[PDB]
Design a protein around this ligand. Structure first.
Ligand SMILES: [Mg+2]
Ligand SMILES: [Mg+2]
Ligand SMILES: [Mg+2]
Ligand SMILES: [Mg+2]
Lengths: 114, 114
């Protein structure tokens, strides 16, 4: 439940004395760390742990978002609506009925990029 | 927030590039965005930070998407594991009055044992 997680993150901005002391840098490293926990769990086909680390990973990315807002005034809805513009623009086939071949998709993508 | 998960779902459905990506490859894509974030922070480049923050949430969520695709992992249960974990480790987030760093850590230290 994503909302529950964003509420959590809101409560941490407002209340948490550990979070107050963390820089985006530090959080960035926390995130690179969970990425490693995820890679290890995939390696072991450890499904219960994979599920744990996926959650850890999303939380930690979202804590980087939070402090980007805290410290740099980055709005997450803006940051999100932006990446959605980019994707939609680059990969227009996402909104097209018939699937298209990898080669078709790339030729498009090569051109969108620029 | 939601248009982004619809986007991701559309990629699971349609995208011939995403079919060819493994969670390892994608973990690595997230690691690289994290670098781009660290960089826009360095340079107090606000427009770019907003960019990369977005890139990072999307890519993180694409790692989640392939965890589901390839390993069966349900994002709602994964988020729920992490909501329970934090609620257990940081009970102060649901307490009215604030608490000190020193207080929060003593607690966290013990809750970590469970
Ligand atoms: Mg972590
Ligand atoms: Mg973890
Ligand atoms: Mg990327
Ligand atoms: Mg980027």
């Amino acid at each position: 439940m994503v909302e529950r997680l964003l509420e959590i993150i809101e409560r941490s901005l407002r209340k948490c004395p550990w979070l107050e002391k963390q820089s985006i840098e530090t959080l960035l490293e926390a995130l690179a760390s969970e990425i490693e926990e995820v890679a290890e769990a995939v390696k072991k086909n450890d499904l219960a742990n994979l599920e744990e680390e996926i959650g850890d990973m999303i939380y930690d990315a979202l804590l980087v978002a939070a402090v980007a807002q805290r410290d740099y005034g980055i709005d997450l809805e803006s940051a999100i609506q932006k990446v959605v513009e980019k994707i939609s623009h680059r990969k227009p086939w996402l909104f097209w009925e018939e699937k298209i071949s990898l080669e078709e998709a790339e030729k498009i993508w090569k051109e969108r990029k620029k």
